[PDB]
Design a protein around this ligand. Structure first.
Ligand SMILES: *[C@@H]1O[C@H](CO)[C@@H](O[C@@H]2O[C@H](CO)[C@@H](O[C@@H]3O[C@H](CO)[C@@H](O)[C@H](O)[C@@H]3O)[C@H](O)[C@H]2NC(C)=O)[C@H](O)[C@H]1NC(C)=O
Ligand SMILES: *[C@@H]1O[C@H](CO)[C@@H](O[C@@H]2O[C@H](CO)[C@@H](O[C@@H]3O[C@H](CO)[C@@H](O)[C@H](O)[C@@H]3O)[C@H](O)[C@H]2NC(C)=O)[C@H](O)[C@H]1NC(C)=O
Ligand SMILES: *[C@@H]1O[C@H](CO)[C@@H](O)[C@H](O)[C@H]1NC(C)=O
Ligand SMILES: *[C@@H]1O[C@H](CO)[C@@H](O)[C@H](O)[C@H]1NC(C)=O
Ligand SMILES: [Ca+2]
Ligand SMILES: [Ca+2]
Lengths: 356, 356
């Protein structure tokens, strides 16, 4: 896993996944309460019923992160225009990953016409604020006060959210697929392994999609009931691929005693994301492991006297190592318990440095 | 001391000394009890008195290891022939060093005519038997059933005691000096640093000199009282040079709490003679430090979990190191506490490997 043939240490990481699967997404809007009528879009119009009570017509948020059977799908649906959605009213889908992940992409399978405008936000820590990841809209400048298909200029801020209309046309009344790719278009993505900026940009504990506006044909110009019952959001699969974040100090994440997902921190690191050196392993500062060298926390010396030490920066600057031992057993002094305390000596058979 | 410029470890040893100085030698015979009369040898004969009570005529064993003032001396004296000494009766002088030394030489300053025959024995450990170091006699074969001036043949037993008459002639009625040199004449003395045989041959906790026979002029052929009172043993200084044994793992010996002399064991060794690895430092076997490489006990790993380990030979054979850790704290397993016990993992913030 996190070590080579000879057994030397080396950078690792869990395998790529879709952190969404199983995760019960939360949506603000969900047709079915109370029962209402929707009508697929085309003439003709084969209308049906969104009903929460019956298991054959339910369309909860749940149908977003369940298995994807290309044969017959499962989707979540919004109340129809008639219920008062369209715009400015919006609908939200929040994916709670419960643990920081290194996100690569967020792809959506729309069971109806993709939205006219929608954005996709993320938090880097369950504390932190909702950050704009990407904006999709046929009216970027007007809807998101943002350029049509802006590109990130070199040198410029690698973390701004862009906007495009490329995915907002209605064209495919169904199967409308949308895919967000974090490092896509970031002038540094090549040097990613040494771009803290991007290394954080891909970081994410939670992801959110905001349906801001429905794409429309024009029929709803005159409040015809039968037409409104024809426009709504419907998603057949919410998939976000990336891999559990561990900084290259683990190759597998696992739920613990408290049922919260975490990293199996190798390289002598610990912490939820293996972002820190286990105490005692403070010979040098903690680092993300690269391909070049798989940074790993090195142990203190102490010579067995102390089982505890802190990281002394000055010591580190002077000598190569900076692991400073604390409270050395057997009246043995020194930065790494390597000497007898003044006026004490090592005298035969007795294990501890004894007085004069 | 026991480390070079850069501070790397290196072979050391206390400084050369005369382990005899101050040490109260013990002699079986000592004129003065009761008062008797001795007469220096030449005619004339200026006789005097050996008396225990008066401090101006006492000649205790003590005058053997006291400072040597070339101006006026101090010596220990035996009862005169008349008291019944000569031969076969012998007299003994036992130097108790109280701590194993690496002996180079034993030299004697005789205040009278050196003995006709005497040997010098040593023990390598206060337990062990009295071993013959050297034999001096004008009649080697007859007195010590040993060759006149035998030499050690190459390949042969490097530890046998030789004999010579070279120092038993009476010639100098006084100032007769005799010097024993351990490595002298030993075909291996050149390669000494890699000759356990010789390395032990020079080892010695105690030294003993045996006065077997007095050299005589012939006058005592007829029991004349005045002549017998003229023959006796008298030594002006007993000096044994060498250095406190520590195997090159110390550069100074010091008396401890119990007032018994010992080594200040560096190189991570301990024991009275630094002949063994402090527990925990069992990555490899203990060794005497040579000039080539200053063998030093290397520490076990354990990764801070255990503060105790034993030396596993098999481990040592398989991998370079063989320090095997015992009872690893924090349910952490492995030869050097480098892994979570089966069905246990390293999960964030918690220091110990916790269950599934
Ligand atoms: C659906 O997702 C969007 C995106 O986060 C949520 O909208 C956000 O809602 C909060 C509170 O309603 C807004 O915060 C407010 O910000 C303004 C100015 O920044 C400030 O004056 C307020 O004190 C407050 O902090 C946030 O701006 C807003 N984001 C955007 C761009 O609309 C929305 O709440 C989610 N669905 C829900 C729960 O309705
Ligand atoms: C002065 O130094 C000499 C040298 O050690 C002492 O002589 C040794 O004395 C012991 C006991 O008197 C002898 O041990 C005996 O050995 C024989 C055979 O090896 C054995 O039959 C006995 O059971 C016992 O073990 C030892 O041989 C002898 N050494 C020699 C070569 O004479 C002497 O005792 C010292 N001065 C004293 C205390 O009289
Ligand atoms: C959701 O969680 C349950 C229980 O942990 C699990 O059995 C189920 O497979 C999960 N659903 C998905 C989409 O994997
Ligand atoms: C003998 O021991 C005493 C007390 O330790 C010391 O003062 C004295 O100098 C010693 N004698 C010699 C010969 O050094
Ligand atoms: Ca689905
Ligand atoms: Ca003297």
């Amino acid at each position: 896993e996190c070590a080579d043939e000879g057994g030397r240490p080396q950078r690792c990481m869990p395998e790529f996944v879709n952190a969404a699967f199983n995760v019960t997404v939360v949506a603000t809007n969900t047709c079915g309460t109370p029962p209402e009528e929707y009508c697929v879009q085309t003439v003709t119009k084969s209308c049906h019923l969104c009903d929460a009570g019956q298991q054959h017509l339910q369309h909860g948020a749940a149908f977003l992160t369940d298995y994807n059977n290309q044969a017959d799908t499962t989707w979540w649906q919004s109340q129809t225009m008639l219920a008062g959605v369209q715009y400015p009213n919006s609908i939200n889908l929040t994916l709670h990953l419960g643990k920081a992940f290194d996100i690569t992409y967020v792809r959506l399978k729309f069971h109806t016409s993709r939205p006219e405008s929608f954005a996709i936000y993320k938090r880097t820590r369950e504390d932190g604020p909702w950050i704009p990841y990407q904006y999709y809209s046929g009216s970027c400048e007007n809807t998101y006060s943002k350029a049509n298909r802006g590109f990130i200029r070199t040198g410029g801020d690698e973390q701004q959210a862009l906007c495009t209309d490329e995915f907002s046309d209605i064209s495919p009344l169904t199967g409308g697929n949308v895919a967000f790719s974090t490092l896509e278009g970031r002038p540094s993505a090549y040097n990613f392994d040494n771009s803290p900026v991007l290394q954080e940009w891909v970081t994410a504990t939670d992801i959110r999609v905001t349906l801001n506006r429905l794409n429309t044909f024009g029929d709803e110009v005159f409040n015809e009931p039968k037409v409104l019952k024809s426009y709504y959001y419907a998603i057949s699969d919410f998939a976000v691929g990336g891999r559990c974040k561990c900084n290259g100090h683990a190759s597998e994440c696992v739920k613990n005693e408290f049922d919260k997902l975490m990293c199996n921190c190798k390289h002598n690191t610990y912490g939820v994301d293996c972002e820190k050196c286990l105490p005692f392993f403070n010979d040098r500062p903690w680092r993300r492991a690269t391909a070049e060298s798989a940074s790993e926390c090195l142990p203190c010396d102490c010579n067995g006297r102390s089982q505890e030490c802190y990281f002394d920066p000055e010591l580190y600057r002077s000598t190569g190592h900076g692991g400073h031992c604390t409270n050395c057993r057997d009246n043995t002094d020194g930065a790494k318990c390597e000497r007898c305390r003044e006026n004490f000596f090592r005298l035969g058979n007795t294990e501890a440095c004894s007085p004069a």
